[PDB]
Amino acid sequence: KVGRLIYTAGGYFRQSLSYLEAYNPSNGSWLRLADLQVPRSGLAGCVVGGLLYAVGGRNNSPDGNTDSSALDCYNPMTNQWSPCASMSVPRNRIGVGVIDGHIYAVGGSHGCIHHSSVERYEPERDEWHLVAPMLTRRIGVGVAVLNRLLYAVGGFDGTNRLNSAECYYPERNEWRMITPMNTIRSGAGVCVLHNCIYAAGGYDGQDQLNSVERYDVETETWTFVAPMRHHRSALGITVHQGKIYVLGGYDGHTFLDSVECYDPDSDTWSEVTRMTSGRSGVGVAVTMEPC
Numbered sequence: 001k002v003g004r005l006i007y008t009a010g011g012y013f014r015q016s017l018s019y020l021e022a023y024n025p026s027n028g029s030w031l032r033l034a035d036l037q038v039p040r041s042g043l044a045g046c047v048v049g050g051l052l053y054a055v056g057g058r059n060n061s062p063d064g065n066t067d068s069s070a071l072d073c074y075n076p077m078t079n080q081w082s083p084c085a086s087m088s089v090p091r092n093r094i095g096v097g098v099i100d101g102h103i104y105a106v107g108g109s110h111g112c113i114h115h116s117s118v119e120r121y122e123p124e125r126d127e128w129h130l131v132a133p134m135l136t137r138r139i140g141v142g143v144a145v146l147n148r149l150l151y152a153v154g155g156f157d158g159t160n161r162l163n164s165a166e167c168y169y170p171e172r173n174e175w176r177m178i179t180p181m182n183t184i185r186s187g188a189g190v191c192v193l194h195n196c197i198y199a200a201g202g203y204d205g206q207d208q209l210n211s212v213e214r215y216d217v218e219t220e221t222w223t224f225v226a227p228m229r230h231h232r233s234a235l236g237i238t239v240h241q242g243k244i245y246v247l248g249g250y251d252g253h254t255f256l257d258s259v260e261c262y263d264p265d266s267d268t269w270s271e272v273t274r275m276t277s278g279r280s281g282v283g284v285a286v287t288m289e290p291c
């Protein structure tokens, strides 16, 4: 369990960013690591087999704006990024989840189109294949995995921001709606902690949110927990040692550098560190510290 860091990749502040930085909760330190080959905001991060993957996004630059179909792999032992097989389609404002060593890429945008499509990556074959599409087109969608089921929560379908959510059952290659959240959320942070899917922050169409709600998969209900100290949309999120960490985002005024930490036992959020600069639209995941 020891020696794991919270990695933040990419993001946006004035333009899409190439940063890869890693935070050590045990000592409060940040390390700046190898830049992404291509700056990207609106991407997702995940880890399989100790390797960090950066998936999708968009390069917003002064010289153009290009949605990304890329999958890039970072090896902490070498501090190097390597390209992996690209997805079938560019996916900005993507969500990803990992089931049994496979990466699922969910939704996202390409230009004006809002995807319902979903595809699955096999690291052992370096191949992607499409699986069943969601019941709803979703960009800015939160994705998490609990009990080897994939959840897609909230987002924006091209016309409305969504409180709806749905679950993918891999053995049937089928999506089913679940109870909708109490709040419309696009660009929330979605993660799993114990037996619940948490949806933190986001944008409801009017304001960035500090509220946080959790879906208990046994009871099929969404319940609010303590709100974050900051309203935030387009935040990064991960879980580490039984606590939720939220990173950055936008509060309606400022690109946040705040990192907050939720303790489920006390139902409290605390400020734990600040990123080296404020940013939104990051990918986040946890893996071994680099060499």
Ligand SMILES: COc1ccc(S(=O)(=O)NCc2cccc([C@@H](NC(=O)c3cccc4c3-c3ccccc3C4=O)C(=O)O)c2)cc1
Pocket (backbone or CB within 6 Å): 011, 012, 041, 042, 060, 093, 140, 156, 161, 186, 187, 188, 202, 203, 208, 233, 234, 249, 250, 280, 281, 282
């Ligand atoms: C060209 O500039 C960029 C490019 C990329 C990014 S990004 O990579 O962070 N992706 C943004 C995002 C992902 C997911 C969801 C949302 C939701 N929008 C809001 O919260 C929102 C609403 C009104 C004004 C603003 C925002 C907002 C959000 C973040 C930073 C600044 C702002 C505003 O100034 C939603 O549209 O539902 C946005 C950020 C800026």
